[PDB]
Symmetry: D2
């Protein structure tokens, strides 16, 4: 375990364009606060449309034919991405501390989970750079026909506050491996790790203008990126409602391509033949990981009647033993919620569950009347039409529902507008495969939870998103297909 850097001085708080640090055009700044100490960390430069316009023009010049970045051979782009992963591993403790200060997640979780995900994602996509291949297509005796997988051009990345550096790297790694240029917008709540990564990008040797970063707000920077007529592609992670606004702005303007990684109403199904202890620990971590602030969070834990009561009992014991406190402390498993708006919203849904009919098995209130901490809550006797079972909580609350048959639980799990992830716990080959096939979800985990790999694609069915991130499938979002058809005389 590394030593927690309790007091770190922030060095990077400016707009990053053409490998230079700039003040905002207006002079405006915004504060970034620590959700644990409830104190301001620093002020970051606040961008607007004029700053986005300078960042898009920087990215266009870097992408123009004959530019140093365009004439670089495929293996050199991979080398640059490996050089960046080395720099991320060198400054791993500085980066994880910035993530903890901005988000409130435990320092050890950001070090061993978020930063490991970033390094792995960068190394996997560095290896694809010289392996992006098109096809040679058989047609007629006198025709030569082939496809090229060309870069799209300028890519915009809009990232969320829960996993700020990870969600940025998920977009940056395949975009740069494909030979594109970028304009990044970190979340208004969490800009520090993105700005740190900027210095490492300059240090790794990327030509100026290949990566540009403009901190600021959704209605200003976000809207300017979504509607820009010179951005060819946008990747967005966040809520379904904001995702819809991004896609509409993209259509209305220049029909730029749009990847969306949105929310879900994720089911977690526990069969009567499951290894109950495994199912209890996995459903527990699936709900409470990152203070329940995960897109993959189990929002509906369906448990077969034969094991329901024991499942509830063993889950309650886990929830009471979960250490909540200072994220810079080695024993901490749960930090504070991101902000007052999220904290009050979780408590509003917890109160709703009480007056709807659920059985509060433990938790149900704040830890102390001073911080943003919520005690791990477990609700039993939860039904399909209750608010705690219908709405995305984004907090530490485990709603446990009951089911009798597989055909029934399939219908109940698929009755949502969402389809991000699903998890199934059973020892029976036929049940597991029937459920893997019939669940309308982008990822189905069997006898595990949150099992993510740089090489396995991730994304949603229905209103949980469009397109995929990770794996070879992420390259299709960052390339344009060109068919060359030559007729011989």
């Amino acid at each position: 375990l590394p030593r927690p850097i309790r007091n770190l001085e922030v060095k990077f708080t400016k707009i990053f364009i053409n490998n230079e640090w700039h003040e905002s055009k207006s002079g405006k700044k915004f504060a970034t606060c620590n959700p644990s100490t409830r104190e301001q960390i620093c002020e970051v430069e606040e961008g607007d449309k004029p700053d986005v316009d300078k960042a898009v023009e920087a990215a266009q010049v870097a992408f123009q034919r004959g530019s140093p970045w365009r004439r670089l051979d495929a293996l050199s782009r991979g080398r640059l991405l490996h050089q960046l992963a080395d720099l991320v591993e060198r400054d791993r403790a500085t980066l994880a501390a910035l993530e903890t200060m901005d988000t409130g997640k435990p320092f050890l979780h950001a070090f061993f989970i978020d930063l490991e995900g970033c390094i792995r994602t960068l190394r996997y996509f560095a290896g694809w750079a010289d392996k992006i291949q098109g096809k040679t297509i058989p047609t007629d005796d006198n025709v030569v026909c082939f496809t090229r997988h060309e870069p799209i051009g300028v890519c915009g990345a809009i990232t969320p506050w829960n996993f700020p550096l990870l969600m940025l790297v998920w977009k940056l790694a395949p975009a740069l491996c494909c030979g594109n240029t970028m304009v990044l917008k970190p979340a208004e709540q969490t800009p520090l790790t993105a700005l740190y990564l900027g210095s490492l990008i300059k240090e790794a040797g990327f030509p100026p203008g290949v990566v540009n970063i403009v901190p600021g707000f959704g209605p200003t920077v976000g809207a300017a990126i979504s509607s820009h007529p010179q951005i060819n592609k946008i990747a967005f992670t966040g809520s379904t409602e904001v995702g819809k606004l991004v896609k509409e702005a993209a259509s209305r303007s220049n029909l730029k391509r749009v990847t969306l990684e949105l929310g879900g109403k994720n089911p977690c199904i526990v069969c009567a033949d499951a290894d109950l202890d495994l199912a209890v620990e996995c459903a527990h971590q699936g709900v409470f990981f990152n203070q329940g602030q995960c897109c993959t969070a189990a929002s509906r834990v369906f448990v077969e009647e034969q094991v329901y009561s024991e499942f509830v009992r063993r889950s309650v014991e886990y929830a009471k033993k979960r250490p909540v406190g200072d994220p810079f402390d080695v024993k901490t498993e749960q930090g504070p919620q991101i902000d007052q708006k999220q904290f009050d919203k979780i408590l509003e849904l917890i109160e709703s569950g009480k007056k709807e009919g659920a059985k509060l098995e433990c938790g149900g209130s704040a830890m102390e009347d001073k911080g943003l901490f919520i005690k791990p809550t477990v609700f039993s006797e939860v039904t399909d039409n209750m608010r705690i079972a219908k709405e995305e909580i984004f907090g530490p609350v485990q709603p446990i529902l009951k089911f009798k048959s597989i055909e029934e639980v399939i219908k109940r799990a698929n009755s949502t507008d969402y389809g991000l992830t699903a998890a199934v716990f059973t020892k029976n080959l036929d049940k597991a495969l029937k459920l893997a096939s019939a669940l309308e979800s982008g990822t189905v985990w069997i006898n595990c939870y949150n099992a993510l790999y740089a090489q396995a694609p991730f994304g949603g069915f229905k209103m949980s998103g469009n397109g995929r991130e990770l794996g070879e499938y992420a390259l299709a979002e960052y390339t344009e297909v060109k068919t060359v058809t030559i007729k011989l005389g």
Copy 2:
């Protein structure tokens, strides 16, 4: 050569749902009129929102787990598509005669071009049904990870008036081969071939609800398909303006996936070392084919200064010998235009050319007041800022521009918001390949024009579209990726 059908009577004019013919729920009907004889062929049922709701419900029931369509093995869906291709070959003359009566295009063009493409596309995708493969991904020693390429669900298709049946087949062939269900809306101007196809779909053996057809108007039937909360995917062929409305409505409702095939400002590049007779004849067919009413139409012909005057001279001669007239008449190379609007805008573009400084070389006015036909027009001394070189003409007007260097023509060719097709004419290996890689177009033809194959993908860069039709790439538009991760004890 086949004989055209004299008094072919239309038999299918109703709404097609669950393999049955229905009258519109409002009782309303609309007229389909022969553009050549200017007389009404018949009255087709006019659908609206409640007919679309009835078709989507029928498609959802056909897509349910355990339905005859879903439980069919992969090779049987291919067998059905081969059975449909056989019926389209048997009734080839009936379908081509319906297409001539609706669009006014020459009978031999619809028989040997449109119907040939329909048959080749159906046969090509019939072969993909048992070859849609996902991946097995290596991760860790104790994990089994894989992807499934599942059907998306209910697909809506919205097609244009210029190639009614072919544009319909381009969407229907990969959708059915991937195991989806469909709700089709033919253009209001040309609904007869789509309705005839419905009878063939029933005869071929497709289960009820797999293909549903709802004739009607854009603001009514089209809008209802775009906004439908139970349609998972939509494919649209038409204009950039209508494509933007379709994509905006899709994002506003349920984030359904959208493929778009739109227009372009397609350049032709003729180098000094081209086979000048090949380039003249290909650029001629590129500008004047189907009365210039084709998404692949060349709207800018760039010619190197060394061959400029001779290219203009031979193009003027070639355009004068072109036979325009009666569609059913064997000798006809160009039937009539589609409508009054755009006909006026073409003559207004022609007048704009004369006033902006271009040299009218031939044509430049209407033919003979008993049908909307334009005389093949050729403009020389054309420059980039002129209207005839900036707007999408959609008529028989050939603007010939001059260029000196390859670097200059690449920049002028790509100075557009569009990028559907491009054509290069040169006998030089390095020039051909430098232009193929530098042109920002979905398709680059070398020493040919309109060379399309069911096996080569087709689609636009920038504002010319999203996604691809044809080839193995069409399958990505009709499938959803599911990752299944299994952790072993």
Copy 3:
């Protein structure tokens, strides 16, 4: 069920070259006998090296550049293969009767299994013809690099006596879909279905010389094909010992590519948590199908101790109820063995099992002292070092062995030089996947047996073969990779 054609007159008994029927150069003929009636069916022309030489020269001329077959577009080759599958389906009853007369397999098994396999294999590979694609490879800014998947050229096919038409089609379908020419040698024991297929090949429209067939013996025709300096590839199905001779002759001569589908010592593992009735019926059909004359035949049935005794009892009941008789009779499940050499060899191994220590549970002798029929035999108490558990029987004998643990049964199943197929029967997800991974076998079936698909590759690990048949993997055996690298100046 079709009507069994009890008395059929054979029409095709000659050498097929350039779509013409020829007598052998020497004048020699060989007899083909019915293993049921023990009477001669007819005399077939007997080829030698001079006949093979004329067949290879016919195949070379058909393959030369500019030949009708080489200039045919990809989709036309697929069309030809579909035309052949239609002709095979038309003459399905004639073909299945010829297979029964030559092999002794039940007419219903040849109609519904062998002939269905042929038709399916032909239709699947007809669909690959226009989908054989190479790659476009990213290298340097100034280099264009791509691969072509070219046909190999003249292909030799040497087929066995157990599934004569099926094993021929497994080789012919991908070879012709890839654009190759062929020289076929059916087994000396079973030439009639191959010669029938020749007439259908001429009838389907294949140019002369694309498929050539030379009946005869292994040391004459087989050796001439293996060593021919103008044959580029050979595919062989048969014994490991003859497979080794084929591969050596291929190396010694011109280094032609060689696919080998050889024998196996196939394990069939039955766990204590298996659905015992399913495991009993699958192991039964796996052993006794085609009179035990299958390359996929279970030679070692390992059963966990908890269910051993019941497994033995239920298996014995199946073996006693199995109908043995005239293959042209609707109730027959088991015909005669192929010949006297095979029949005496099976009885020699059955006697060996008696004097080695096995418990003869049923069967053990011929049905009548007049025919080639052997009564279904089941041996219990079989151990690893017994002859009935070590050697390939190729007859109706079920050796049932016992195991205690999974780690033990993995070591015992993998202790062979072979690795064709394996089958596992369990309801536990982890056991099934651990066994699928750790068994060194080309195909692992879980809760099924003999589940073959045109789209799933088949072949052996270790001494069970080289290369694969079926699926997309079969195309790699029938194409040569060419890299084209172009440097731009």
Copy 4:
């Protein structure tokens, strides 16, 4: 430019097994001598059958299930290969000096050509380790079918004397990236770089037994690897005659898979429209690079009659200015030949040219009696039936043949039993593509020669080899396909 090492002492001369250095079991040793100074560098341990048996056993234990190598995750094998590439870059000067002392090739050629290829190949295949994906195949509603691309097992590698370390890396990089274990045998003439690599393999962290190195002779160590019953795959680079012995021995023992990279009779085709200075300089490097001792050497230079005399004139001038001499000397373009045999056969081929009717234009004899060097020779008026145009020279002799038509030169170029590489020089798009598709060669270079990439496959058609090295195609040689079919109840 780097400085050559003056008195570099060799440190690694023993047998490498289980990450340890061993003396040969017989105690025997053999001498490695510098071909330039003609003095003994050192005495390397001489292995035989019992040392090969000890290396195969160590490789089998490293390949067992549960071994540290097998249980490593896919990304960690790539990490190890990147670690090895870093050590090869660090010790680049030591490795290139060892290669110069063993082969006599110029120090700057081994530093910037051989060592560069080794580093690029290792880095390329390090990126494939987590991207080797099998397929999920669609079959029936109730079946789950998939393929796994598993490692083959123990791989033997047998390399030549001309590019010792590079040919070793071409086999080692994909074998280790696929998870195999290896037994290597460097050429008897050049074993020092292979032994040095072994120390780097231990330093990099590869578990013991993963790579084992056994120096020795062909008839002893090579024969034992070819016939070993526990080696699953062998890769061989060398002559067609030795390759046939290796493949015959492999088939005779256990049917181990064999990749072969052999010689060729590589043509150069120069069209009348070529850039004549480019073609002269490329055909010169193609004939005289590495003293003509390269598998890619041009052995037939076909020139169109229109440029024939001028091509011969400029080639004669170019060959006269070529600097031959001391390898460590910066100015040297061509060091000495390898051995006494072949040196005599080259002068005998040269004399055969004069007597058969060819015109000796320059060179044609030895240089200066104190080393085996030949003066760059050029023959004009060469015809197909002549010895200088039929035999593989393997020396600095340029035979220039004349041609009139493209159809004629295609036939003359392909009238060989070989087909490794071909090179075409033309500025014409149609000629370049017609020749690329009609030449029967594994690689067709256009307007370049020796343009190799770790990402483009390389190998021969006909008797030039079996299988491919480099690119994604190399992975098929180092994996075995397993189909897993699961039928659901």
